[PDB]
Design a protein around this nucleic acid. Sequence first.
RNA 1: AGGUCUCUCU
RNA 2: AGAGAGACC
Length: 463
Amino acid sequence: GEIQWVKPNKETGRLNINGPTRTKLEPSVFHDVFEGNKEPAVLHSKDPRLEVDFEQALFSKYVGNTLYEPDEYIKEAALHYANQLKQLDIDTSQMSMEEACYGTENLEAIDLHSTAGYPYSALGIKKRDILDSTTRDVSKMKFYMDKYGLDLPYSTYVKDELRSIDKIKKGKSRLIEASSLNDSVYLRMTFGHLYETFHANPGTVTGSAVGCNPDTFWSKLPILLPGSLFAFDYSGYDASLSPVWFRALELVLREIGYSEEAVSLVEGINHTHHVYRNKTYCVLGGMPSGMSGTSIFNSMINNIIIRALLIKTFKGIDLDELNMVAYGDDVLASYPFPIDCLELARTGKEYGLTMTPADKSPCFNEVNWDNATFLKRGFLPDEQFPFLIHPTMPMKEIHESIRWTKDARNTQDHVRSLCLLAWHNGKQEYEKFVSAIRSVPVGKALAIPNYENLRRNWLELFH
RNA sequence: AGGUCUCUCU
RNA sequence: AGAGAGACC
Ligand SMILES: [Zn+2]
């Protein structure tokens, strides 16, 4: 991704997009009970903790673009993945606006508390005044579609969330690039059936884990991913995508039978305009963060990427022996023989991709079931039933979460959610967690799940 | 203040 | 179905 220009909103004629300036996160009653280093992300250029210019840091993620058109390896990768997708029989026909607005079995209805985007946010029109769940009304929608059209700018807001200390010093807050309601609708109409298919079929046919539930999906993954594992991390995956990967996405969509009218929506993703505060800017390459379908297209692109990297890096790769699942940039993959990611990362650099070892060290060490992580969780076989696999979230990350709150009124829900994550680490660690919670008066006031009930509820998911 | 999953409350 | 929360990407 690369920013092509920046202009004042007077010159472009766009309405200003202002976002909140102060965090909703304050220390919780557990802030001193548990260790942690994270704090709310810098949200304002005048944050005292900054040690860099804020807006420079905000847009450094756009590292540039290298390739613009597919080479042989990317072509073969794209075609191999699309062929794999054929066995899913995706309905490449346009989904209805009513289905696209109000939802189906495998596609959530448009969230009515998520923003409407440009220009609706600026001119006060609310999503509640245009869509009605009881009515399944597309009347006003069709109007505002005709009124404001498509290819509207994405509205840029900084994300209010915890971040590590180095990321606060360095200004590295994350951005939400919220699509406009009209483009959500058009994208959900064009690809909603594909979204349905992916959501219902997390695994190694889609190559996607969007829609997975880790409590149950973890037990499938060692069977879906036989052989030797490989994985690695990206730095700034979304922002580092060169336009070649959106060309490659077009290859995939066409080969599984999408119309050229549908395939043509991809250039509107590759080339996007954003309003942040009082400025407009153009972005060439790079996936927009808050687009309808961001995770699914990131995940498909990743399937193209891993295949290409394999067949360009090594001789004799049989892509039919690759197994992988991606959630956006996060990837876990396997192959009958070990894969050297040091060499994959070298090839990745040529494509404009920055790939680093999965263990966060400087060396690409072996990835096995005992150290692999996906969606930040490890893999722990149950002591009683070793075919059942616990997704294990590090207590360190749960410790960081519980030290802060956005509304202390829901302390109960917050602690319960963390408990549903924490018990997978075992009885002793869980009871150490609960004891620490209860060492504090608000802690003795909470209904806290008992470990044996958690375990039994999880076992029952498999019967 | 984008999605996915999970939980909670009418 | 209506309101909320948390985690992850
Ligand atoms: Zn432009």
